[PDB]
Design a protein around this ligand. Structure first.
Ligand SMILES: O=P(O)(O)OC[C@H]1O[C@](O)(COP(=O)(O)O)[C@@H](O)[C@@H]1O
Ligand SMILES: O=P(O)(O)OC[C@H]1O[C@](O)(COP(=O)(O)O)[C@@H](O)[C@@H]1O
Ligand SMILES: O=P(O)(O)OC[C@H]1O[C@](O)(COP(=O)(O)O)[C@@H](O)[C@@H]1O
Ligand SMILES: O=C([O-])C(=O)[O-]
Ligand SMILES: O=C([O-])C(=O)[O-]
Ligand SMILES: O=C([O-])C(=O)[O-]
Ligand SMILES: [K+]
Ligand SMILES: [K+]
Ligand SMILES: [K+]
Ligand SMILES: [Mg+2]
Ligand SMILES: [Mg+2]
Ligand SMILES: [Mg+2]
Lengths: 519, 519, 519
């Protein structure tokens, strides 16, 4: 009894909703939340990379704060290879996007005791001198630590904190030298080569779009990447600089700004406006601002993105435990579920799938949790608030989209099939968060790939040739969707589905909503 | 600034809604609430009857508790004559329904001092003997009063109250005779011939469907009347008896039960179930139950009807003052507005248009008020509760209807055009109470006439011949609606409208919703 | 600008609420969510145990699935010693509760290769024979594994899964022997001595209250423990058995049932009824039911407990990372915040403070997060739903409690001071979740200790002697509270506070609510 938390989504109060969550109430088979996997050593093999797709991966993240263009291009080459191995059946084929995550303006240390993987070790109380003297860039040890950020002494003050290697090792500025800093270890631990360095509450003047970044960005264009995750986006101008760089050749590449610092949070509205999406980069944010305040920023950002109808990604450490274990911790499971309940379009994995010993189990665990959570969403209230907070508009497609969602809730439809060239029609259906999956049928493969950034949209790439009889070309595509659905288990023959189409070819003419039974 | 109370319908709380009602905020030109006018001496002239239609009349009520079949048939004949005078332009033509209101089981007195219009006069304290002795049926005076209800002494007790002529004259049962009753006048006033008599809290055994009623009902069928207003409906069986009488030949005649007594109110759910609609007959109800409790019964009945999606009429004394004056009282204006706000499909006039000296002003006053009130409805909350309280269903037309309404609210559409044979598709749109007018296009004239019983539906009768190309026959009708709309001032060229259609000819296939711009 | 998320708790919609969470909006200094710390090797030292209290600990959990009575009595002795070291100032004194967590019916393995801390290692595919033959209880290795549960072969089937050491190592029943089982390792890893064993979807007949449990429970009474956390509570009868055991001598010891398995979840209502509180024991639950479904059970249990007004504890792995690191992962921070937002009375730590290398940092991290989260609660909606879902009652204290909370919201009071003997009066204020801290003043120390189980209640133990003038005895206590408040930073001199008192000594006479300014 009870499917996809029906008894619960049909309750008057949120509290009653909660009281009704049933672990014995199976969820639907469809999974709306996109899963971005950072690709690395543990997941670079075309062989295992096919298992990544099978398991759930939708977007492949290339962390460009590491690796050479020659390396990534091979990663990219492998992704596409594994991806296409399924293209021999347009029905079962699952598009996969490629995202380039810029290095941006980050600070890192040099090499430890010369050796490649040598690791010194600081101790509470011990002192450490930070040098900018390049002579030591490959001679880092318990007393001298080198950094890239050379303009450092001019932005950091006496009494400041410096964190290294994901804020695990903290230091305090005792004395500000000329080309160096005399700190004092607040908490030790071992220190490896080239690690991350955060300067909380310090105006780091590094370039929004560095030299190397422009290189990587132009490489992304040449590599035909679907999206770019810009790191350390502080203001709107920063987003604009990335637009310019991508320029005309890549005007269609979505720029997902990453909020990793305090300025980014303050100037969020400004950034969200100039971006296509947002990523709540918790890793750096958890070091830049006190950890206890991160869920506030996450919830705030996810909420404002839902209001704006722009994609939002919740990333970093969602399943860290799994880098070394086959099972995630109770807190990690709880974390994922809440990101979905918070209303995030995509959840992410980094170390979990880049170097961990259980990449496939991590990805699989996210498919599972997001599916359970998506069902626990309180649609009754969410739909209501979204419609209310939604601006007044006279755009036929906008009205058609809301109508489709309302209609879908009314008949518990198996899905909302949408024909789209650019994806916009399907985006609009998504911004109203229906419970049914949004099967977006398209012939444009870039839009099919980029579609994963949206909650609910299940991209489907039509390969069939255009019929001369537009009416039958449309009906053909609607059937394509109808089959994908039947095959993936979203719905059966008798079931009812909502179909969105337009009155003439081209974009921006969606305006037809039909409640159709499955063939 | 502000149209049709937009500022107000867009407020978070009801209280804020009220605070925003603007008398300087003009309403749309369309009027959703049907207006039923009781036709009589003051409005029987084809010449004036055309002005009734112009002014706003949608349904013509024939009070069959008076007049001869020969008389009514002529009334009917005149209505249709005045009505068809406009048929020479399908676009400007306004359908008009004919309703037969049964006499039912009513009690009336005999003739005063023989004379036709003679009027005696009782006095508080004075005694009055009620006789069943037929010898006096034309000899009524200050001492002997005759009644039709002969089984009276067997149902009335000592101490009971008897009201005469719309509860204006009250009497009390002092002594129960064998064939008479010795009362005492509680409040006097004059007493004319054949007046109404109520026996509050008394189980009058009169027949739900009397002899004469069966005659009148069968006459209704032969006269091809759209609806029947059954008087004093006490239980479901009563409604059933009227169904049977109308039988197969008139199975398509809508039976609007009238709640006029205490039993009717108690067994309401039972009655509403077996009926097509309900009429809150306040006149008799105001005598049968204490006046202060009428608004409770009205609001209760109207609310339950909205929940059930069945038509509800608020009738009697809405504009009495106007029987003799050109202006209505503040209370009457207030009464009409609240009936609309209460959510009644139709408002009614009786004496105001049957014998009053300003029938046209009364009808015009209702077009005016209803329009103002319709705009003051708090749709935000109404729509919400209707959808919640609405049962779960998998009927495609139902889903399509809700979708259309949601869509209409999203783009402030000028209308919701609906193609329907039986009326059902348009009914469903109406039960969800959209702000826009529901232009229902049909070729069946009976359904066009009966449609007035529903809030929002604006019937439009298509006279064009069926095209062989169904697609074009549909498009033709949608354009018919599009023109009626343009001509009645509902919308202009650029405006957007919602259009409801189906996928194949025949009833029950509506499932297509399109946001279309006006040609 | 903005304090304790005021701008946010004052928004019409939840979505708007979220959009307003400000990381730059400091929270009040008071922290409502109780913190239960499991005491062990890393936190048993009276010296460090004083730092546990300073850092935030409110309740000390004794995990009786380990250690000897002699050991625990010493832990208890140390807790009280550290606790009382502050009693020399009733104002700054912070009560601390002692909770006994039963071993209950658990299954564990024997010893590895004889050696105390020796660890074998299974491998996927490899086979393992499970023996009940006591000869091997201290000879466990890669081929023979021993178990306590001897009736095992009779409840497990062929094809079943067996998990060992927090579901990290899984096994599958290939062949069911007579006194043994021939399994196959699904996922390896190392295997230590005496580890946990779960038999998902298997009806383990072990005793609700085992032999050892009765011993421990009686020991708890003799030790004067405030509460008992009953493990693996499956039905109401189980709770009853624990009541009986504690019997008359310990009728005042609160029984917090722990839901660790599937039956417990199904029969929750039954258990919640018979218990004083509930603990969502995620560890075992996460093994007993699929991990992805835990947040469903957690949110469900927490919600139903808030509805019932009984304490609920969210426990296990909330900050695992911190067992070895000074910083928690983003997921763990997110986990804690959501448990508070979910509406849990208490958060807990186990390995984090029993054996971890940073117990104090773990406890401190919870004080911090819970405070931030408590401020992000959406009171506007929570209060509303709690009041609506709250049964109708004529109990003066109940009405007085609601009135106090409403009043507190109206004037942004610094606190709600409540005089209570049993605690009940303060409980009732807590079940309505006010934003302000509930300073409960009492002379009964057991009730001051047990009060931590409730969200918002800040226990304060009055040591002053009873005045003969009851009126002044009361006024004295209210002032005691008034000072505690001023010292802890809850409120200043000018501030306003809500005060709850009664009209006569004894319990159940609270009925007086006063809005008083701080002396
Ligand atoms: O690309 P968009 O803006 O989402 O619009 C989707 C479009 O695809 C259609 O359904 C079919 O159009 P095409 O044949 O050009 O692909 C249109 O009716 C509609 O305008
Ligand atoms: O009469 P209903 O039940 O309201 O249905 C309206 C019907 O009219 C249409 O719009 C047109 O049908 P017709 O050509 O038969 O009149 C259908 O698609 C739809 O089924
Ligand atoms: O113990 P309870 O049931 O919470 O009631 C609190 C009681 O404490 C008082 O505030 C003060 O009474 P005492 O002096 O006996 O402690 C009473 O008025 C009230 O009845
Ligand atoms: O880049 C990231 O994912 C981060 O900084 O958290
Ligand atoms: O018949 C009526 O209109 C009444 O009784 O109110
Ligand atoms: O007992 C516990 O806390 C558990 O099992 O998770
Ligand atoms: K990066
Ligand atoms: K009548
Ligand atoms: K235990
Ligand atoms: Mg980063
Ligand atoms: Mg009447
Ligand atoms: Mg346990």
């Amino acid at each position: 009894i009870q499917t996809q938390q029906l008894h619960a989504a049909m309750a008057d109060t949120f509290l009653e909703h909660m009281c009704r969550l049933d672990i014995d109430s199976p969820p639907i088979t469809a999974r709306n939340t996109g899963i971005i996997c950072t690709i690395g050593p543990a997941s670079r093999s075309v062989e295992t990379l096919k298992e990544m797709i099978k398991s759930g991966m939708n977007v492949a993240r290339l962390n460009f704060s590491h690796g050479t263009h020659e390396y990534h291009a091979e990663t990219i080459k492998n992704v596409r290879t594994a991806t296409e191995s399924f293209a021999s059946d347009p029905i079962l084929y699952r598009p996969v996007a490629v995202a380039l995550d810029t290095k941006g303006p980050e600070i890192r240390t040099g090499l430890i005791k010369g050796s490649g993987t040598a690791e010194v070790e600081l101790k509470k109380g011990a002192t450490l001198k930070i040098t900018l003297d390049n002579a030591y860039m490959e001679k880092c040890d318990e007393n001298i630590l080198w950094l890239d950020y050379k303009n450092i002494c001019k932005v950091v003050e006496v009494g400041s904190k410096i964190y290294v290697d994901d804020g695990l090792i903290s230091l305090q500025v005792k004395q500000k030298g000329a080309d160096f800093l005399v700190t004092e270890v607040e908490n030790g631990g071992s220190l490896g080569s080239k690690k991350g360095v955060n300067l909380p509450g310090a105006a780091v003047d590094l370039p929004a779009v560095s030299e190397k970044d422009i290189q990587d960005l132009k490489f992304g264009v040449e590599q035909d990447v679907d999206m770019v995750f810009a790191s350390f986006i502080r203001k709107a101008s920063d987003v604009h600089e990335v637009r310019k760089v991508l320029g005309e050749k890549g005007k269609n590449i979505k720029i997902i700004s990453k909020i990793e610092n305090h300025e980014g949070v303050r100037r969020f509205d400004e950034i969200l406006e100039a971006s296509d999406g947002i990523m709540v980069a918790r890793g750096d944010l958890g070091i830049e601002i006190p950890a206890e305040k991160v869920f506030l920023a996450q919830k705030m950002m996810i909420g404002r993105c839902n209001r704006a109808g722009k994609p939002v990604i919740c990333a970093t450490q969602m399943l860290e435990s799994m880098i070394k274990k086959p099972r995630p911790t109770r807190a990690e499971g709880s974390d994922v579920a809440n990101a979905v309940l918070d209303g995030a379009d995509c959840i992410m994995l980094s170390g979990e799938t880049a170097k961990g010993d259980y990449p496939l189990e991590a990805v699989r665990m996210q498919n599972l949790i997001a599916r359970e959570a998506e069902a626990a969403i309180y649609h009754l209230q969410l739909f209501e608030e979204l419609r209310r907070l939604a601006p007044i508009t006279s755009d036929p497609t906008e009205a058609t989209a809301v109508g489709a969602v309302e209609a879908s809730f009314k008949c518990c439809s198996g899905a909302i099939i949408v024909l789209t060239k650019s994806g916009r029609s399907a985006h609009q259906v998504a911004r109203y968060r229906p419970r049914a999956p949004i099967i977006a049928v398209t012939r444009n493969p870039q839009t099919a790939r980029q579609a994963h950034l949206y909650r609910g949209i299940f991209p489907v790439l039509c390969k069939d040739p255009v019929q001369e009889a537009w009416a039958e070309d449309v009906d053909l595509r609607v059937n394509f969707a109808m089959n994908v659905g039947k095959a993936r288990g979203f719905f059966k023959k008798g079931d009812v589905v909502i179909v969105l189409t337009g009155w003439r070819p081209g974009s921006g003419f969606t305006n037809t909503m039909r409640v159709v039974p499955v063939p």
